[PDB]
């Protein structure tokens, strides 16, 4: 009962901690840098074949193949250099809000309101695309699933939990708790050791995998959260909320650095991504278009308006030569 | 200009065909969306016809297959799982005629109906509206007029008056009455009356849609 007081004192102590380490005001550091310039992009390729909304996408480690998931009960694989279709996989639950392409290129994975991240094998004799596993254990709705190897996946569910698994068996090898609301995102690190999450409780969390326990908490928003990604150096990340704002957090100072807003924007973010050099942040809004930002000056440097509806998904590739956007108008795009 | 990248195109020229053939076949399996007050009538409204997270359903009628994605049992926010239902063909709404006194209930259902019939994703989305548990409403007013829950009402505390009053009080919350329509019915099946009403309403909505997919408005 009375223990609710030590909580407030410890909160004040943590505030003083992550405040005393603040004397920079990052925007006040780059006063002398030359800006990017101005960035126009051209829709090199366009990808059709979906008959309804698409809810996510993921590229491959070769920069050339990608994957999409839609509401027509379809998971399609694309060769983005020729707009050709390699595979079209039919689904069982058309309430889909996730997808993934494994690094090895062998497997993929989906997930939705069925509370199951079905996992598919692409390279099998018998010439077909069979479903290898169906992984249950949740009581919510999968909002993101991301691989680590060909035998270790990570899921995040709306029941305020996340989970690490093991395929050949099917049993949760780890569970991650500490949320007070719906989790709606995920992001793994380049060293595939410690991931990160961000939930509708206006809070994000920096976890660990081996151990199992949270490591840091992050606040600073005024509303829920809908997207998150890292910064190449596995030493920062970026959150996108429905309050029209996108923010950059660091992991060594435990605080936010820059806030990305503009009074003429009211709509809500859905997806976020970085660039191979971490010098340009992409953001997908609900105003039927997208945006672009510079991660060191806070000032826009371009726009990618070519969409007749919302922008639900987005993702840069490893090499760097391209970008992508998914939209509720059922047309994928490839800029560059 | 191409050697064996010409058989990687007789593949993407069959995959598309199969996608179409799988997309020109969802139409005849129309998609409804049941709703209801707190455990009011979502039980038998599903089993009107007798042929894992969110509930599916399937019942057939004159070469028309209805799928009723009951969603009144998913414990999350009213929003983050609702825009997954846009494009749906219609909506249903099952309310009780006499349970208003429990806890009132009529008020909650009215608040729900207002939150629904003016949602951002349900402007052009039509509605059906059933009124179940009627044979009992003939008694509740017989002894307890609805002025308990509508003191501003004064008239014959009887079926053919009070019931019509509630019907015309529910059929008039739509802030726009030209775009979308709103139907009405009662649950006296004869084992097959209501589902016929759904058939009629759904074919009418299909028409009102095609008559915009062909510019004929």
């Amino acid at each position: 009962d009375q223990l609710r007081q030590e909580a407030e004192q410890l909160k004040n102590q943590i505030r003083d901690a992550r405040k005393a380490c603040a004397d920079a005001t990052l925007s006040q550091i780059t006063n002398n840098i030359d800006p990017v310039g101005r960035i126009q992009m051209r829709t090199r390729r366009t990808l059709r074949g979906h008959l309804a909304k698409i809810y996510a996408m993921h590229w491959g480690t070769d920069s050339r193949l990608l994957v999409s998931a839609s509401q027509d009960g379809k998971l399609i694989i694309w060769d983005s250099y020729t707009t050709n279709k390699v595979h079209a996989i039919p689904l069982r639950s058309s309430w889909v809000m996730t997808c993934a392409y494994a690094p090895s290129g062998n497997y993929v994975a989906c997930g939705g309101l069925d509370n199951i991240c079905s996992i598919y094998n692409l390279k099998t004799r018998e010439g077909n695309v069979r479903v290898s596993r169906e992984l249950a254990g949740h009581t919510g709705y999968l909002s993101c699933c991301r691989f680590l190897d060909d035998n270790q996946i990570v899921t995040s569910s709306g029941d305020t939990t996340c989970a690490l698994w093991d395929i050949e068996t099917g049993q949760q090898t780890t569970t991650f708790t500490g949320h007070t609301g719906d989790v709606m995102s995920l992001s793994l690190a380049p060293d595939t050791r410690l991931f990160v999450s961000g939930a509708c409780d206006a809070s994000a969390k920096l976890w660990d995998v081996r151990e199992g326990m949270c490591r840091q908490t992050f606040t600073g928003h005024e509303s829920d959260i809908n997207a998150i990604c890292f910064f190449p150096n596995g030493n920062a990340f970026a959150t996108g909320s429905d309050d029209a704002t996108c923010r950059l957090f660091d992991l060594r100072a435990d605080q936010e650095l820059m806030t990305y807003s503009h009074d003429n924007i009211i709509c809500g973010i859905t997806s976020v991504s970085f660039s191979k050099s971490g010098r340009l942040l992409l953001a997908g809004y609900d105003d039927f278009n997208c945006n672009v930002w510079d991660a060191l000056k806070a000032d826009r440097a371009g726009v990618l308006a070519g969409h007749d509806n919302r922008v639900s998904c987005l993702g840069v590739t490893d090499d760097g030569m391209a970008v992508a956007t998914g939209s509720w108008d059922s047309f994928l795009k490839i800029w560059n | 200009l191409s050697a064996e990248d010409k058989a990687a195109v007789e593949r993407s020229k069959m995959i598309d065909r199969n996608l179409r053939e799988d997309g020109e076949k969802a139409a005849r399996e129309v998609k409804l969306l049941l709703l209801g007050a707190g455990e009011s009538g979502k039980s038998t409204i599903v089993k009107q016809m007798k042929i894992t997270g969110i509930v599916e359903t399937h019942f057939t009628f004159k070469d028309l297959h209805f799928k009723m994605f009951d969603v009144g049992g998913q414990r999350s926010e009213r929003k983050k799982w609702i825009h997954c239902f846009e494009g749906v063909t219609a909506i249903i709404f099952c309310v009780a005629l006499s349970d208003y006194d429990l806890v009132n209930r009529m008020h909650e259902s009215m608040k729900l109906f207002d939150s629904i019939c003016n949602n951002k994703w349900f402007t052009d989305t039509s509605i059906i509206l059933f009124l179940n548990k009627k044979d009992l409403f003939e008694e509740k007013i017989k002894k307890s007029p609805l002025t308990i829950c509508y003191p501003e009402y004064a008239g014959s505390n009887t079926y053919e008056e009070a019931a019509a009053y509630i019907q015309c009080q529910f059929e008039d919350l739509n802030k726009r009455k030209d775009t979308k329509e709103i139907y009405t019915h009662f649950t006296c099946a004869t084992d097959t009356k209501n589902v016929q009403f759904v058939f009629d309403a759904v074919t009418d909505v299909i028409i009102k849609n095609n008559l915009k997919d062909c510019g004929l408005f």
Partner: single-chain antibody, 232 residues
Framework: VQLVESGGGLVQPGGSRKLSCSAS????????MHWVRQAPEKGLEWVAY????????YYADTVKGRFTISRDDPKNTLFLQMTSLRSEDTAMYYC??????????????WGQGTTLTVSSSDIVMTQATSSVPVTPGESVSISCRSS???????????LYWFLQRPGQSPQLLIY???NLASGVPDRFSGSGSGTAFTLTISRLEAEDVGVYYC?????????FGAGTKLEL
């Protein structure tokens, strides 16, 4: 997997004959199919190609008119029909597989084939050697040379390396001059460019002795070497 062939036998010249393939264990409808041929003591010759959907058919300049390929996807069965036979058509025929898409592995399962006997501008690939003595532990490098550049401008190298042990049927080893199949070890490899192609083994061992072959899929028709035997 299985791919059986039937129909072979002994006919009189001028007659006609049918040959049937029966598959068991894969999505037939999603796979191209060929009919490679081999004579008693010579190399391999290509004869046809049907595709997925049946809307594509090729043939060899030697056979157009009298050989008719056909396919029945439901019952997973292929067909070849022969009219106006001769003695140059005495040979063993092999049912085969082929799937094409980015990341594929054509000629990844050969059948066992039937036998047919009777009474009495194309690229060329030069397979000179016809015998090489060896002893285990020996590391060898076989040669294949072409009459044109195989590399298409899209960055690839449309050459293939095969193998065939005695009393057996072939078994892919390499596809596209660099890439390695699934079901073989890291002992094999290959490399080169533009009419120069070298195979590479390390730590030889029995079950490798036979007749390696060569092939190109840059443009139809398809042409083979003539047999680089490898004995002890």
């Amino acid at each position: 997997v299985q791919l059986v062939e039937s129909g072979g036998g002994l006919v009189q010249p001028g007659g006609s004959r049918k040959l049937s393939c029966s598959a068991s264990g894969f999505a037939f409808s999603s796979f191209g199919m060929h009919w490679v041929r081999q004579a008693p003591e010579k190399g391999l010759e290509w004869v046809a190609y049907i595709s997925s959907g049946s809307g594509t058919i090729y043939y060899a300049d030697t056979v157009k008119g009298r050989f008719t390929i056909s396919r029945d996807d439901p019952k997973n069965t292929l067909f070849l029909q022969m009219t106006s036979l001769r003695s140059e058509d005495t040979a063993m025929y092999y049912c085969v597989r082929s799937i094409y898409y980015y990341g594929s592995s054509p000629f990844d399962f050969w059948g066992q084939g039937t036998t047919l006997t009777v009474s009495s501008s194309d690229i060329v690939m030069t397979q000179a050697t016809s015998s090489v003595p060896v002893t285990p532990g020996e590391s060898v490098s076989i040669s294949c040379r072409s009459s044109k550049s195989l590399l298409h401008s899209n960055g690839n190298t449309y050459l293939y390396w095969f193998l065939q042990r005695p009393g057996q049927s072939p078994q892919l080893l390499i596809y596209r001059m660099s890439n390695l199949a699934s079901g073989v070890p890291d002992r094999f490899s290959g490399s080169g460019s533009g009419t120069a192609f070298t195979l590479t083994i390390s730590r030889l061992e029995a079950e490798d002795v036979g007749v390696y072959y060569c092939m190109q899929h840059l443009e139809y028709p398809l042409t083979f070497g003539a047999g680089t035997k490898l004995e002890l």
